[PDB]
């Protein structure tokens, strides 16, 4: 069940936007692990369901333009 979703973000390198990112994901439900890595500006979300569009919508409202990546290919 648990599947790993990835995204490419532009903007997330400061000690606040990282939280707003993960919190943009944690506010879901199916998410049960999150990997927000600074400098690489690469998002991962481990969730037992596809919610990538949902996390995107969240990150969009949070004010970060991402691109939905594949599920680790």
CATH number for position 15? 3.30.70.100
Question: Does residue 13 have a known ligand-binding role?
Answer: yes
Of 62, 31, 61, nearest to 47 by C-alpha is 31
Domain that holds residue 30: 1-73
What span, in angstroms and rounded, lies between the C-alpha atoms of 22 and 27? Answer: 9
In what order do the strands lie in the sheet containing 42-47? 31-37, 42-47, 3-10, 65-68
What do you get for the CA distance between the two ends of the chain, in Å?
Answer: 16
What span, in angstroms and rounded, lies between the C-alpha atoms of 39 and 51? Answer: 24
Q: Between 52-62 and 17-26, two packed helices, what is the crossing angle to 10 degrees?
A: 140
Phi, psi of 52 (to 5 degrees): -65, -45
Other beta carbons within 10 Å of 3: 15
Q: Is the dihedral of CA 37, 11, 3, 19 positive or negative?
A: positive
Task: State the total domains in the chain.
Answer: 1
Question: Does residue 14 have a known ligand-binding role?
Answer: yes
What span, in angstroms and rounded, lies between the C-alpha atoms of 3 and 40? Answer: 21
SS3 content of the chain, % helix, strand, coil (to 5): 30, 35, 35
Q: At a CB cut-off of 8 Å and minimum separation 6, what does 2 contact?
A: 32, 33, 46, 47, 48
């Amino acid at each position: 069940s648990g599947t790993r979703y990835s995204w490419k973000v532009s903007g997330m390198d400061c000690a606040a936007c990282a939280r707003k990112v993960e919190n943009a994901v944690r506010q879901l439900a199916g998410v049960n692990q999150v990997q927000v890595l600074f400098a690489t500006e690469k998002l991962v979300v481990d969730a037992d369901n596809d919610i990538r569009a949902q996390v995107e919508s969240a990150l969009q409202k949070a004010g970060y333009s991402l691109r939905d990546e594949q599920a680790a290919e």
